[PDB]
Ligand binder design. Structure first.
Ligand SMILES: Nc1ncnc2c1ncn2[C@@H]1O[C@H](COP(=O)(O)OP(=O)(O)NP(=O)(O)O)[C@@H](O)[C@H]1O
Ligand SMILES: [Mg+2]
Lengths: 584, 432, 445
């Protein structure tokens, strides 16, 4: 093939002549070392190239070779439970092949273990008519996730011969007489990262996701197929928010993208996720979790490549029928990458230096996520829940990243430094944080629980909002200017946030709190408040009305991993009733 | 025809060579080496070379083997009477996979400027069925009236209600509704679709859908398409059209995006600088022409930044658009649906649209006395703002029952409630 | 070995060389001046036979015709040997200690390479700083990235020296080192550091690099990269627990602003360059522990929130990058307490990995939660009383407010030259915590 000669090297920009046969946005091995790169603009026979590795030491005169294909990810068996480079290079194989503990330049790594032998059991029958997305057989990659092998796009015809057996990723396992010629396919397909995987139909997301986190599930819920943002200053709990919902969400698959963030965090995830097990099926969370690491030191172009690769994997496992949850750690790092790339290209700057297309790029990402009807005959339903972390400026969030983000998403968990400052570690701010799905979630919750729970959550939020007013009123006298009911209402709001709202301090029992327990917790709190108030009206006085059981706060911690919650939690209701009447 | 001389590709732009008879703002289509076909539009033409922007993008183009064909016409929309009951994309191409539509004729989408003398003033009001709009800042056929709201304030919900309950009392022929969705998410878009199907307005409406996923340059065309189709129905077919465009904010965002893509020097507050003219060109395609039956009315829905510091400046458009309607989340919090802050909303054309013979004429007098009741009723409760220790507590309770009653009842009539103007008047009488 | 005598342009501190080949980006160069002086520079942009270099020292006095440029074939390298300890260096790896040149074992690119995430080992164990607030409340872990934020003032500088001499691993380990990098400090600032090291006998334990304000701006960039290269080398080749301390990274990034301005890069926030975050990150993420090796690099960078402590780009980006913070407040500085540490803002995320029974005493984790809560509420009462008398304090808030006073007055202010062991900090905290009613606290004796 034709060889291109480097004629210019400026930062991460490389220009090379004699590249007529190349096309726009084609990966290419640039320089002697052959570092990976991408062609972003072509003028005459010369090409301007964006690289994804440090170009320190690359000069003019060196050769440039094109791969003739756009950025793509290998989609086949072996993906699950692996950590990848922003361009899908597997890091473990990377370490062994290079025999080094660092990241070098120019390494050629297949993303998937092509040599490993898998047992493929075929489900389609010979003679069946097939289309894009139709599933022919399944490989049991994990005891939990059955890797459903399905017909790629652009292929339609009649199967010819298909049989179960032991094949690798490269061996052809099935062949289809297509409209012209014969097409034999493997268990692996390549897919361009930037363009979304096609679907048949898109749907509304109306199934709440069980985060486990009390404040989220109760007050600001996100549905399966929705999108959420976590804006917060440093030291707030946004990274660990993604961690918790990656651990405990009732979702079949989890994809974690940590662009431009600390490496210890990714190392921590890969060590603790296998140690963490799930008793529902007896195996670790890594059997279902996927990882993509692009740290701060790693080159900046890979930071965009990392989030795009992550969602392409999520859309893959969505077309199988599973629900996926993908979370990007500090999407700002992506936007900050895109900004300096706009400046080096001397593009016309948009707002705050970011390119004008920022709002468009962002909108393309979140709208790839959703609850959809996947391609094929069965028309299975799959979903992707998108969680985005944004770290911006100081505490100030009104910057292009979060503003454009909130323009396209319906869930906003806003962390504030003051709440994290007071060691309210779940620092989701109430009264600003909002979930536009909350009204739909209420209907779902009432039908599933066969109880009026929506009115409970409106009552809880109304009490909290009331407390905000009473803080401004409390300046005059601490406890003698307010009203009797207002003092009790204060104590109830205090109980809500100090018991329900506050979440784990890396405590096993305080980490999850099942939906059934969430119900009982909020009910015991709400009954206490309303009983104490209505019973206070009948000549009961608050001086000693606060009495007896304050252990309720403490009580909510325990009885989680075992079903010891029913007795323990409703006994609190009956006990508080008795004690209220006795106090009289 | 089928020139094959691409000499440059930069970002989403292209440079073609040895082309002649190429005009500015002329549509081209590109034949790639892989037979894929993409549309683009000429944006600059030199002595022999020309420079175009590709809608879909430039990913995957091999310059040596790709080809370009110059269509010879600018962006057009095919007009037909069969448009009703149909859904189109940003560029007016069928999106519901329905019957193929043979255009009566293909129309340039930029439109034309009505001669000032030719334009006919609007004197007849339109019954929205909304007490908080009909009584006060009333809407007249041909008026340019916009609703300003923040995200999640139910602005879309109000827009839906207006679409469903819009009608006129004469009703010799029924109303026609053209709805454009500009750079909005699927969930947002789906809301409108579901309402129209459920309510049956799709058979009585025509719509153009442009989501955020779609390219920015398609957003520019989306308004132009909707208004060109509205004008076709309105003037050539004499229909009475209500045009509702949802979030011109993102039209403006796309305007900035295209300006930066074309390497144009920014105008005031980082925006293109021809925003005033671009918006005014859009908004001024309304009203009635004398000597023609039809009419065009516009209710542009606009997301409003809480701050006045940045986005599609409310007063940039507000003085272009003959009044405005304000929605606020502070309002919305206490079950106030449709949350219409009535303090700063006005319909610039309310006075003439209101009179006996066009309205039951308690209405002008009663609106003015209830406008006094707005001011005095606000005085009574609204102005207190947790103050009024003595004010309104001295048998001004008539006042200190009026306005809270008014704010709750009148403003929140319910999103699925249709109030006949006479009724709205009556509930004003009750409040009197 | 080639000397090029063709220089087409000189513009401020940047010059361009015509008719050259075989050059590479970021390469170094040496200029032969007409008078024979030698200046070091580095290439910034290359195309075809033209090269674009920027001289560190400056272009003043350069006759273009009678001057030439040499291409060294390599980028910024620090020569490394295990004799670094005891010899004091400047920002460019040169000797500032009146010492003989080292026989370099090998030459290392200062930029180094990223630690592969799986190969990395998570931070653990406990390093004893001698600081009650640091060791107890905001624990330090090997490979952690803990910084010091202060107002412009004396507290930071004193704390830097104190940490350097006292900070030792709990005896268990075979050996220990410290690497000191000094950025944008006056000659006296430098001499204070060097004299305390010579006087305390820690100079033999440690390697240090000194860069001053008079030295060129680009040298400040080089200096941290040098220091971290040597620190990496010691931990990851010679298996020592390296501890790196850096001085006023504000001075470092003001060098970045000056440099970018010279290169006409577009500004970011507050005039600082767009790539501030990642650039800071490239230094800070070289700390940690590698799997399959012993010895580690731990970084305690130092910085002042410039001017009014607004937490402006320098501190905010650093906070995003590090794993915690220790900050100094001028209100506490005004008061007698030294070091002035407001515990509430300060935080160490990895504290729990380095604490508990075994590594420390079993009570270490339970004590800090109680002392934190009691401080916050004693200060709550403290400010509460203000403009409301002591009546509101009543009995409970009164004891609480005085707890806060006592806490700041002896627990926190160690004195700048007095070491505290972890056990005596804990036991002191107990004596301090004994004032409180045994009913309030969170766990049993
Ligand atoms: N349940 C919890 N929720 C949130 N934060 C918590 C919780 N428990 C502890 N923390 C604290 O949260 C901090 C970690 O938050 P983290 O999200 O990692 O910071 P961050 O905002 O992501 N920094 P960055 O992502 O780089 O901008 C630590 O100091 C923990 O002590
Ligand atoms: Mg983080």
């Amino acid at each position: 093939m034709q060889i291109g000669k480097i004629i210019k090297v400026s930062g991460p920009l490389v220009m090379a002549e004699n590249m007529s046969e190349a096309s726009i946005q084609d990966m290419c091995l640039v320089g002697d070392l052959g570092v990976i790169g991408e062609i972003i603009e072509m003028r005459q026979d010369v090409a301007s190239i964006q690289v994804y590795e440090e170009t320190s030491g690359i000069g003019p005169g060196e050769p440039v070779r094109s791969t003739g294909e756009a950025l793509s990810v290998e989609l086949g068996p072996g993906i699950i439970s692996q950590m990848f480079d922003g361009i899908q290079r597997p890091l473990d194989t990377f370490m062994e092949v290079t025999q080094s503990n660092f990241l070098g330049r120019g390494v050629q790594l297949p993303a998937l273990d092509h040599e490993k032998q898998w047992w493929f059991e075929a489900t389609i029958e010979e003679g069946t008519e097939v289309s894009a997305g139709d599933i022919i057989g399944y490989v049991d990659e994990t005891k939990i996730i059955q890797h459903k092998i399905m017909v790629p796009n652009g292929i339609k015809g009649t199967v010819q011969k298909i049989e179960s057996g032991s094949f690798t990723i490269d061996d052809p396992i099935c062949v289809i007489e297509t409209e012209q010629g014969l097409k034999e396919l493997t268990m692996m397909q390549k897919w361009p990262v930037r363009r979304g995987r096609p679907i048949k139909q898109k749907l509304n997301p109306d199934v709440p996701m069980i985060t486990g986190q009390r404040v989220i599930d109760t007050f600001f819920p996100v549905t399966k197929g929705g999108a959420a943002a976590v804006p917060g200053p440093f030291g707030a709990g946004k990274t660990v928010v993604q961690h918790q919902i990656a651990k405990w969400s009732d979702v079949d698959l989890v994809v974690y993208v940590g662009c431009g963030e600390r490496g210890n965090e990714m190392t921590d995830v890969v060590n603790e996720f296998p140690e963490l097990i799930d008793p529902n099926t007896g195996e670790s969370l890594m059997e279902r979790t996927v990882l993509i690491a692009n740290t701060s030191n790693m080159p900046v172009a890979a930071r965009e490549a990392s989030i795009y690769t992550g969602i392409t994997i999520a859309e893959y496992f969505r077309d199988m029928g599973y629900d996926v949850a993908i979370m990007a750690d500090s999407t700002s790092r992506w936007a900050e990458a895109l900004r300096e790339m706009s400046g080096r290209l001397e593009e016309m700057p948009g707002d705050e230096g970011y390119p004008a297309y920022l709002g468009s790029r962002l909108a393309e990402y979140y709208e790839r996520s959703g609850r959809v009807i996947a391609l094929g005959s069965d028309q299975r339903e799959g979903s992707i829940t998108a969680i985005s972390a944004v770290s911006p400026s100081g505490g100030d969030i009104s910057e292009p990243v979060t503003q454009n983000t909130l323009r396209v998403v319906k869930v906003f968990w806003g962390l504030d430094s003051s709440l994290a400052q007071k060691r309210h570690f779940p620092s989701i701010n109430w009264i600003q944080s909002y979930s536009l799905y909350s009204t739909e979630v209420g209907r779902y919750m009432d039908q599933i629980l066969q109880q009026d729970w929506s009115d409970m959550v409106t009552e809880g939020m109304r009490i909290l909002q009331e407390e905000e007013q009473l803080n401004e009123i409390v300046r005059l006298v601490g406890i003698d200017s307010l009203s009797d009911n207002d003092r009790l209402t204060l104590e109830v709001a205090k109980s809500i946030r100090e018991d329900y709202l506050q979440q784990n301090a890396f405590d096993d029992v305080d980490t999850f709190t099942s939906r059934e327990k969430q119900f009982n917790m909020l009910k015991v709190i709400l009954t206490f408040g309303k009983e104490a108030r209505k019973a206070l009206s009948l000549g009961a006085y608050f001086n000693e009305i606060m009495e007896g059981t304050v252990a309720v706060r403490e009580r909510i911690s325990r009885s989680k991993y075992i079903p010891e919650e029913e007795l323990a939690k409703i006994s609190s209701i009956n006990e508080e009733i008795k004690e209220t009447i006795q106090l009289i | 025809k089928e020139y094959r001389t691409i000499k440059e590709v930069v970002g989403p732009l292209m440079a073609v060579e040895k082309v002649s008879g190429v005009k500015y703002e002329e549509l081209i289509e590109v034949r790639m080496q892989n037979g894929e076909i993409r549309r683009g539009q000429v944006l600059e033409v030199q002595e022999d070379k020309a420079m175009v922007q590709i809608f879909e993008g430039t990913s995957g183009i091999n310059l040596k083997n790709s080809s370009v064909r110059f269509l010879g016409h600018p962006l057009q929309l095919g007009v037909s009477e069969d448009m009703i009951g149909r859904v189109f994309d940003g560029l007016g191409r069928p999106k519901d996979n329905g019957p193929e539509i043979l255009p009566e004729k293909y129309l340039d989408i930029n439109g034309e400027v009505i001669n000032p003398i030719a334009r006919d003033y609007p004197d007849e009001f339109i019954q929205t069925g909304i007490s908080a709009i009909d009584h006060l800042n009333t809407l007249v056929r041909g008026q340019k009236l916009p609703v300003f709201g923040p995200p999640g304030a139910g602005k879309s919900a109000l827009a839906a209600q207006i679409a469903r309950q819009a009608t006129v009392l004469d009703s010799s022929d029924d109303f026609a509704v053209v709805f454009a969705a500009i750079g909005i998410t699927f969930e947002e878009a789906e809301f409108f679709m579901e309402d129209f199907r459920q309510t049956g307005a799709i058979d009585r409406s025509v719509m153009f859908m442009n989501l955020a996923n779609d390219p920015a340059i398609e957003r520019i065309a989306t308004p132009r398409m909707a208004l060109t189709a509205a004008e076709y129905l309105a003037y050539e077919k004499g229909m009475h059209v209500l045009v509702i465009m949802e979030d011109m904010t993102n039209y403006a965002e796309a305007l900035r995006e295209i300006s930066a893509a074309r390497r144009e020097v920014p105008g005031r507050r980082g925006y293109p600088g021809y925003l005033y003219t671009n918006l005014a060109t859009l908004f001024e395609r309304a009203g009635r022409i004398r000597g023609l039956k039809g009419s065009v009315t516009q209710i542009p829905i606009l997301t409003m930044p809480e701050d006045d510091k940045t986005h599609p400046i409310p007063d940039l458009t507000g003085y272009i658009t003959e009044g405005q309607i304000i929605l606020t989340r502070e309002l919305y919090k206490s079950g106030i649906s449709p949350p219409i802050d009535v303090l700063p909303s006005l319909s610039r054309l309310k006075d003439k649209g209101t009179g006996a013979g066009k309205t039951r004429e308690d209405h002008a007098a009663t609106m003015n006395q209830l406008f006094a009741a707005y001011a005095q009723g606000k005085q009574a409760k609204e102005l207190a703002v947790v103050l009024g220790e003595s004010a309104l507590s001295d048998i001004d309770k008539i006042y200190a029952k009026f306005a809270e009653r008014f704010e709750n009842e009148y403003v929140n009539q319910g999103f699925y409630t249709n109030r006949t103007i006479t009724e709205t008047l009556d509930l004003g009488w009750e409040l009197l």
